[PDB]
């Protein structure tokens, strides 16, 4: 690891849907990349607009993303969504 990867507790309901969808293995692959280098140009890494806010996404599959931010100073990644839906 180089970064601590956290998830917002309110995003845990997302992980329940990931688990039921059998997306756990894809999701944890993204987690492993976030631990090593959250800016690696893999997994369809995207810098979301507006770019000055520095929110990012990676593809779990063609429907769902992990959306996250990064605290560079403290080397922490914050996962905010793992399910691409309004709830």
């Amino acid at each position: 690891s180089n970064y601590t990867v956290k998830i917002k507790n309110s995003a845990k309901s997302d992980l329940k849907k990931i688990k039921h969808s059998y997306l756990k293995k894809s999701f944890l692959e993204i987690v492993e990349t976030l631990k090593n280098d959250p800016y690696k140009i893999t997994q369809s890494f995207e810098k979301l607009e507006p770019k000055y806010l520095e929110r990012y996404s990676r593809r779990i599959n063609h429907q769902h993303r992990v959306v996250y931010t990064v605290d560079d100073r403290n080397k922490e990644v914050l996962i905010l969504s793992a399910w691409s839906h309004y709830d």
Binding site: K6, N9, K12, K16, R55, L78, L80, S84, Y86
Partner: protein, 85 residues
Amino acid sequence: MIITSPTEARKDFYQLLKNVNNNHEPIYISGNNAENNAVIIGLEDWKSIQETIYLESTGTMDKVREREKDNSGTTNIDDIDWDNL
């Protein structure tokens, strides 16, 4: 704003493609018939835009912005109990 004519853009097309990606700024093609005006954008920036519009229209970014605001706390991803989710 980087603005060029259709004919100048055609003449310097290969350099224009390098510039939109090196500079991350679109290039505006503006000519006499305004109905054929166009924009060149580097593919990475286009992909960022398209990914933003998709996640916004699904309501995902709404959910994200609200979660950034709440005080639900965080859990280290390795401490998630998947078996009991």
